[PDB]
Design an enzyme around this catalytic site. Structure first.
Site, mmCIF file in Angstrom:
data_model
loop_
_atom_site.group_PDB
_atom_site.id
_atom_site.type_symbol
_atom_site.label_atom_id
_atom_site.label_comp_id
_atom_site.label_asym_id
_atom_site.label_seq_id
_atom_site.Cartn_x
_atom_site.Cartn_y
_atom_site.Cartn_z
ATOM 1 N N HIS A 1 -23.646 49.713 14.762
ATOM 2 C CA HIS A 1 -23.665 50.430 13.505
ATOM 3 C C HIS A 1 -23.928 51.946 13.558
ATOM 4 C CE1 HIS A 1 -23.256 46.772 11.313
ATOM 5 N NE2 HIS A 1 -24.531 46.395 11.231
ATOM 6 N N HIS B 1 -23.251 47.659 3.758
ATOM 7 C CA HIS B 1 -24.056 46.531 4.158
ATOM 8 C C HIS B 1 -24.927 45.928 3.079
ATOM 9 C CE1 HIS B 1 -26.118 44.188 7.161
ATOM 10 N NE2 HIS B 1 -25.339 44.719 8.110
ATOM 11 N N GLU C 1 -18.978 42.675 4.963
ATOM 12 C CA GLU C 1 -18.648 44.006 5.352
ATOM 13 C C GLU C 1 -17.200 44.104 5.646
ATOM 14 O OE1 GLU C 1 -21.778 45.164 8.282
ATOM 15 O OE2 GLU C 1 -22.224 42.989 8.025
HETATM 16 O O1 LIG Z 1 -29.095 42.906 10.896
HETATM 17 C C1 LIG Z 1 -27.959 43.745 10.803
HETATM 18 C C2 LIG Z 1 -26.739 42.849 11.033
HETATM 19 O O2 LIG Z 1 -25.549 43.595 10.674
HETATM 20 C C3 LIG Z 1 -24.326 42.845 10.834
HETATM 21 O O3 LIG Z 1 -23.180 43.600 10.431
HETATM 22 C C4 LIG Z 1 -24.220 42.401 12.277
HETATM 23 O O4 LIG Z 1 -22.971 41.766 12.628
HETATM 24 C C5 LIG Z 1 -25.406 41.488 12.558
HETATM 25 O O5 LIG Z 1 -25.302 40.979 13.890
HETATM 26 C C6 LIG Z 1 -26.662 42.340 12.480
HETATM 27 O O6 LIG Z 1 -26.629 43.429 13.412
#
Ligand SMILES: OC[C@H]1O[C@@H](O)[C@H](O)[C@@H](O)[C@H]1O
Length: 344
Positions: A109, A178, A309
């Site tokens: 991210h 998110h 997402e």
């Molecule tokens: O807790 C944040 C989450 O965000 C998602 O997009 C990701 O695929 C998860 O594995 C985790 O990183």
């Protein structure tokens, strides 16, 4: 369904004189959306059930400080590149680039200080707000200066998020939001009673580190087949799954296409998602451990919320058979996602 009106106010102030954060409230006759200039974070999202009762269906915090603590990307914009990059490394035009390994052994991210943790500049629109920021060259290991505009608008029960960017040099880009949803309301403990449908024929199986294997697996006969509404709890059960955290491959063109539908029969709330994105990360909040101090004394336990997402596939930058993720100078990155709220 009326066009929203927008109000603004001071929400908080960043430490080390990092700047004032504002809160923008978008309101229509159907929905109420709250958003802050810190990471273009949706902070609350109020939607009605069949009785006409409004509940905020989004997990989050009541104060800025809530977001500044170690929390899992709540309701924020993610970038430069969402999700994971194997080994925090990729090459572009023959040059190898290295990113922060913020999620051993990968990069996740956007890095240490991703798009969700920076102050955006807001411009109020007639029916919404636009945030803009410049991600300079080298930001978080990425090449190129990236100019981004995140625009949120509201009209009736439809919230629209658009992402626009311009790079001064070829760089990967993959932006998303998110927000963690819970249609039974933010305070419900779980999403087991949710009914989910994802219009995907294939999915991306992953590895021990959660990087895609490279395989574009068909969902047929698998627990990943969500083309027909399934009750989340039942399904997970029947399939012996802990939950999801996978990218579903959308039948993509760059045209607005149906992505997924989430229904909560008891309240009757329905969330429908459309997007221009090639995929969608469907993550059932597996990592929440019920230690976060949420809104209204809510604590968020595992499975208390799910994310959708919309994005390009993870690790695409290292997987040539994946949809292109590079943005070169001269082109424009432009993706839109529709969050349509309703009652059934
Ligand atoms: O807790 C944040 C989450 O965000 C998602 O997009 C990701 O695929 C998860 O594995 C985790 O990183």
């Amino acid at each position: 369904g009326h066009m929203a009106s927008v109000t603004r106010a001071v929400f908080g102030e960043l430490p080390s004189g990092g700047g004032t954060v504002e809160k923008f409230q978008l309101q229509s006759d159907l929905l109420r959306v709250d958003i802050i200039s810190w990471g273009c974070t949706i902070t609350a999202l109020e939607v009605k059930d069949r009785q006409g009762r409004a509940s905020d269906v989004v997990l989050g915090f009541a104060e800025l400080e809530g977001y500044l603590q170690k929390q899992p990307y709540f309701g924020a914009v993610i970038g430069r590149v969402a999700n994971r990059i194997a080994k925090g490394t990729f090459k572009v035009d023959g040059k190898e680039y290295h990113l922060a390994i913020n999620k051993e052994p990968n990069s996740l991210h956007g890095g240490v200080r991703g798009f969700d943790k920076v102050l955006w500049t807001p411009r109020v629109l007639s029916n919404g707000v636009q945030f803009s920021r410049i991600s300079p060259d080298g930001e978080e290991g990425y090449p190129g200066e990236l100019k981004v505009w995140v625009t949120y608008t509201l009209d009736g029960g439809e919230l629209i998020v658009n992402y626009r960017a311009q790079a001064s040099q070829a760089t990967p880009v993959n932006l998303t939001n998110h927000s963690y949803f819970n249609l039974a309301g933010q305070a419900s403990p779980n999403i087991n009673d949710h009914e989910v449908t994802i219009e995907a024929d294939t999915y991306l199986p992953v590895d021990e580190t959660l990087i895609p294997t490279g395989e574009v697996a068909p969902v047929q006969g698998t627990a990943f087949d969500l083309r027909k509404p399934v009750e989340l709890g039942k399904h997970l059960q029947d399939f012996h799954l802990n939950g999801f955290d996978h990218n579903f491959c959308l039948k993509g063109s760059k045209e607005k296409h149906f992505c997924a539908r989430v229904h909560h029969a008891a309240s009757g709330r329905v969330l429908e998602v459309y997007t221009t994105q090639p995929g969608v990360q469907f993550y059932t909040g597996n990592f929440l451990d019920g230690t976060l101090k949420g809104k209204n004394g809510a604590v968020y336990p595992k499975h208390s919320g799910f994310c959708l997402e919309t994005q390009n596939w993870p690790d695409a930058v290292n997987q040539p058979r994946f949809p292109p993720v590079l943005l070169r100078p001269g082109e424009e990155y432009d993706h839109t996602t529709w969050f349509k709220f309703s009652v059934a």
